[PDB]
Amino acid sequence: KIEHFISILGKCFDSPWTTRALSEVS
Amino acid sequence: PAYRILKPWWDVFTDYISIVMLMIAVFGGTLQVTQDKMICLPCKWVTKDSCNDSTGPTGIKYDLDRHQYNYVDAVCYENRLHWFAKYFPYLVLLHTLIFLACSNFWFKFPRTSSKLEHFVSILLKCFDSPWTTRALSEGVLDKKEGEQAKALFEKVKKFRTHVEEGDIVYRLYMRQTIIKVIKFALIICYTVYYVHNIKFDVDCTVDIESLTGYRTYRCAHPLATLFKILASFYISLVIFYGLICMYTLWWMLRRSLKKYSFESIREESSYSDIPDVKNDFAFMLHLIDQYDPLYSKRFAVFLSEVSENKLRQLNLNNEWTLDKLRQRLTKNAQDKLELHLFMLSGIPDTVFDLVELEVLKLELIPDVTIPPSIAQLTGLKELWLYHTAAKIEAPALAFLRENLRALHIKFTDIKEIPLWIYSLKTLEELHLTGNLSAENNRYIVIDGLRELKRLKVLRLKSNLSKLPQVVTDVGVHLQKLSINNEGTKLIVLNSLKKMVNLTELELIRCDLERIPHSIFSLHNLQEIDLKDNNLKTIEEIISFQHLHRLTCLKLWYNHIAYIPIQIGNLTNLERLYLNRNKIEKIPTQLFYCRKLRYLDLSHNNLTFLPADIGLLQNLQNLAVTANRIEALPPELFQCRKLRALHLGNNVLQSLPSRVGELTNLTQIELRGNRLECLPVELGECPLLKRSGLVVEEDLFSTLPPEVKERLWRADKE
Amino acid sequence: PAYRILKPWWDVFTDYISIVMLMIAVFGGTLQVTQDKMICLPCKWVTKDSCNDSTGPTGIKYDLDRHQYNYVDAVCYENRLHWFAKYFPYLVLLHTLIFLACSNFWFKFPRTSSKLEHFVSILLKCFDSPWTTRALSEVLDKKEGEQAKALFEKVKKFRTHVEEGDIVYRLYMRQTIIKVIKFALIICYTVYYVHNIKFDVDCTVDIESLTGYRTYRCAHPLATLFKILASFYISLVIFYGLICMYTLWWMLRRSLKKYSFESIREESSYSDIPDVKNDFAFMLHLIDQYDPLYSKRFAVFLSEVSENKLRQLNLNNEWTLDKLRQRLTKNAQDKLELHLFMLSGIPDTVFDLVELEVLKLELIPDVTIPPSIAQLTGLKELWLYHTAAKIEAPALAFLRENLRALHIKFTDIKEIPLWIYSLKTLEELHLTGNLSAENNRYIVIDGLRELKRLKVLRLKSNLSKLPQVVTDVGVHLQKLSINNEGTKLIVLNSLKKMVNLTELELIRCDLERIPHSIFSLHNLQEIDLKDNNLKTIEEIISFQHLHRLTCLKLWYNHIAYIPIQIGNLTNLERLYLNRNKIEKIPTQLFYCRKLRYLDLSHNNLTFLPADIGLLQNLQNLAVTANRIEALPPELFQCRKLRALHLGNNVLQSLPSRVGELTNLTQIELRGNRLECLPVELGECPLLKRSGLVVEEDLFSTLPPEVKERLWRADKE
Ligand SMILES: CCCCCCCC/C=C/CCCCCCCC(=O)OC[C@H](COP(=O)(O)OCCN)OC(=O)CCCCCCC/C=C/CCCCCCCC
């Protein structure tokens, strides 16, 4: 579970759509 | 590893000084475990708890065993040797360990370590990136390298947002510096104070007379001079460490490391848009400047929106390949090759590499510049500008001046229209859709269409309250004036008299509520459209015999409830589009005009069709769709040129068999009627097919299966 | 790792000597820590605190305990043994550490470590670059050329970065100076104090109250060993001195802040390599000391001649001869064209191909044509657009015997070539670009007087006024076309001198009046006034004086009616009057029956008039887009018509005699109102389906035998 969490969180951290949704929010 | 860039010369100096100090600590420690002792000799004569110090010489006989001597050594070493001499190497080791922990606390503390590793990684990988050299040199770029460049730009932006919020790294470095300097002060104070207590000769008085026989002994500490020079060397090293620490503190406090000005890099390069980075980001960039200004110089190119704009344009040139543009090519209503560019960052250069393209469609393109590579676009004739603020290169401006012939401009703001459209000379078709009427910009912006000379089609969907004086100046050569106000009445004021060369006039959705006299003053018109002008009465058409050339009177989408008989004077009409009106009866005088070819009276209030329709032999497409016509007269089939009988949505009870005499019929619409059954003679039309014969399936089933086979074969063959 | 290039022989020697000195330092330190002791025996007979040195023998009974002996040893080792004999290995260790710190402060100081690492990376990248081999040879892949250009730019940026200041040279000089003075002090004090390491020591410490004896004689067992560890060490320092001294001489015999590439720029062809200076010069001198080949093959990245060679080689690999034949096209003159657009440089393979006839150079900057343009055989056209052409004297002389036609596209004076005036053997020339600038009214075209064989000059330069220089130049002119694109042309009767003109084109001159100078030239066969916005042609009465005009061109105008007098021009053979405002064309106008070509499309003709029957020596009539309903006997008295431009009309029918017109190249029917094609059109198998343009629904009404014959003749 720790490896799955860190893999998901790291791949989310380099996801462009995270920045896209942050721009949409703010 | 890669943290060396974040360690300036002071940090390296303290790192090496701490290493040498730890070597001193280890050496002193192993000597203290190994050969630290005190050779003690008793004083034979004592006087008030002190040694008296009062024929050949002979040695003094103490009568002590070797083990009594060892006991005396251990007791006096424990009791009367100063604590500094005993615990100097361990104190030095503790001090050096604390110094190393202070120098390496920010590397291990997760809150600062995450920021530090992010900074080091993205800064190093920006430093070895090739697009940094490409931008600082100011082509073609590899796909993988382009993906790396865009990912690095996004990572730099997200890290800049992530780091600038707080100043945890600056505060931690500050606190480490004050802790190190105050510990240096304490170390130097106590070590200098207690360094003189390391003595070779120690007088001990330990009260072990019951076990040995003597009370006071004079011991020699052998590792006292060696420990003294080791302590002096340690004091000198701590002095150097402390001086470096106060230099670091002065460097931190003299300037403001929380504020970086990029004025050196931004003025050197063409990028004047690099922001003044602040806070923690500014702090580690100052640290990198203490290492090497080149890293900051090559990193600053990733903080400017000009650089990312150029990168986006180059990447868009790269991704939009030629073959995908070939499969993107389409055709318009004018049978010209077409390419719709919708919602792109810029315009691809591979679009401009095309040669077969005729109409390029620029829709929602924010602030792009037209490259001169338009010299390749020789077949380009129609530039379609939708909400696109376009800047123009001079050779491309000349090329469009000598090639481009049709420009459509839609804009939301009157500043969005390019100012180089007036310099165009080969332009004939202009479509200015969007409000030209604004305060002090009401037709003053388009006052430069006087520079336009060959303009013949001027579409204006622009909510014009009154028609411009500039089109009164231009309309000597204008041949079509399509004005859409979407609900604003024109005060024409008979100003079209100077506009004599019009062949078509399309006043659509103008809410005129009456036909003005400017159309009547003109003479060259052949296609008159008055769509959605709310024309309640059209009684003026008696004067339309003055217009000897009119051939298409598109009086549709209006409030026309009747037709005056003077339309019989209009023998020159070929297409009379009266559909979607309120006309309830056709006068027979309208049926005098033998030249009518497209009699579209659909969506109206007609209840009957006069028989005189048989006189209209040139009629081809009679569309009476959605009317109240119950029975078609046989004389309707007298006209043998009916090509498309749109009888749909009517109340036709039965279609007579005389339709079998018609030959030009290609598509007849009967679905939605009261038609009981389809007669057999409907199959007698040769050119009619299933696509042409649109009808309900059960109505199709009424035809004979041999006639149905003929029609199904016309669908097949 | 990769720093071994920056360590010359002296640095390696000093590093090895420092390692050996550290070895003997730790050896002496281990000895001094572990078995350094002093065996002190009391002198039983003494004289004034000095050792007097005065039946089997018996041992001297000193009556001393073992611990009294240990105390005597400790006191006379601390008090009387010399400090050098006790702390020699620690001094050697400290000196060796100082020497190592001085040697490695070059690599450990960040300010110079960054520059050293950058220089190492750049030098190794240039060392492993394949293009250097080609640079030392006198084909490369796309990746090879791209990385060569990128590393060229990196070398230029590094040269800008490092040459500005000398921090590496200053630190190296300071390190050498410090090492030299440290060697001097070390040799001085070690030689002075090496004579105190003695085996025998007379100690007198005054511990008589604790031992009973005043003076003792002590043996220091390690002393002799320390002697062979001291003098040896001295010898090492001497070497470490002399080598360092040599290094100092190497930093003073010449200015290391001025590297000269004279040997390389003399041996190699590149003579443009600059004399680099400062830190760049110092590290290049160090690399020369290591290996001259690194500097030799790095010197080719400091010259712009090698940069130009790489650029031309890269563009040569881009555009091979096969891709040139791929890009080969043909123009309107049926000549071989090669559209070269947006290239950083001109190729050489494009001049290798002798087939080329029209060398096209559109918007190609930094153009410098080598004499390999002499390789071109059919070169008679040079379509240079927005091109600044530089041509050497042999290639210019080659142009002086083969070049014939030359088109220039320019933005005022910026893109106008200067070598065109010396060209005296060309025959055609074109110009395009605004010339009527402020204070420069037609002053830039004053150098076209040496051109004597020029015959064709065409201009499109939006002239507000007629240039007097043009009138002076045009003496030897045959064809001249003037395009003003919506600007007034003030001829002002100045064309009377232009007697040699045989074709005068005035496209979009917006004249609205025919200038009176046209009526003076008896050589003009073609008069072109297209898009002049002519409404009333009342100047054709004055055209009666001319007897040379064979074709008037008043098309794309608004001529409401053509007057009667124009029917007096028998020499007219081609009437281009299409897209005009002509309502009824008079029959008297068709008294001239030798109207071979005719353009009357897009007009307002309501019927084809009578004296078309008079016409006999024609080949086409353009009746597209007017109000004519039928092919009358008037068009049917013509027996030489070949193309009918009758499309998008209200033409009701084709009567029978058009089915006798077997020599019918084309018909145009793009929207005409024909009932059906008559069976008389089946009388002519000469007209094929590709030959005529007929609507698909109109074409299918022909009989199946006729349609099969039409498709057959399309195949046949
Ligand atoms: C605070 C952290 C410190 C870390 C400590 C590391 C481990 C310490 C434990 C040591 C493990 C085993 C070693 C014990 C050996 C004890 C033998 C002993 O005490 O015997 C007494 C007797 C007394 O010696 P004297 O000849 O009087 O010497 C007086 C000097 N003029 O000693 C002996 O007989 C032999 C001593 C054995 C020495 C062992 C240690 C030597 C260490 C080598 C030092 C390395 C020097 C490095 C460079 C020096 C500078 C150039």
Short mmCIF file of C-alpha atoms in Angstrom, two decimals, chain B residues 14-30 89-100 234 237:
data_model
loop_
_atom_site.label_atom_id
_atom_site.label_comp_id
_atom_site.label_asym_id
_atom_site.label_seq_id
_atom_site.Cartn_x
_atom_site.Cartn_y
_atom_site.Cartn_z
CA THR B 14 33.65 24.18 7.10
CA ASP B 15 33.14 20.64 5.72
CA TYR B 16 36.91 20.13 5.38
CA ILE B 17 37.68 21.86 8.68
CA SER B 18 35.15 19.58 10.40
CA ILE B 19 36.77 16.54 8.74
CA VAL B 20 40.22 17.56 9.98
CA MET B 21 38.79 18.36 13.43
CA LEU B 22 37.18 14.91 13.56
CA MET B 23 40.57 13.45 12.65
CA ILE B 24 42.01 15.37 15.61
CA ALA B 25 39.24 14.03 17.84
CA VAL B 26 39.84 10.43 16.73
CA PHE B 27 43.61 10.75 17.23
CA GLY B 28 43.25 12.27 20.69
CA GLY B 29 40.64 9.69 21.62
CA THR B 30 42.71 6.67 20.62
CA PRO B 89 39.07 14.47 22.70
CA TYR B 90 35.50 13.48 23.58
CA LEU B 91 34.45 17.12 23.91
CA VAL B 92 36.08 17.83 20.54
CA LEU B 93 34.26 14.87 18.97
CA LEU B 94 30.93 16.04 20.41
CA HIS B 95 31.50 19.59 19.15
CA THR B 96 32.45 18.39 15.66
CA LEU B 97 29.45 16.05 15.50
CA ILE B 98 27.14 18.92 16.45
CA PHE B 99 28.85 21.15 13.86
CA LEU B 100 28.35 18.50 11.17
CA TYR B 234 41.77 22.61 17.69
CA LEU B 237 40.61 25.33 13.63
#
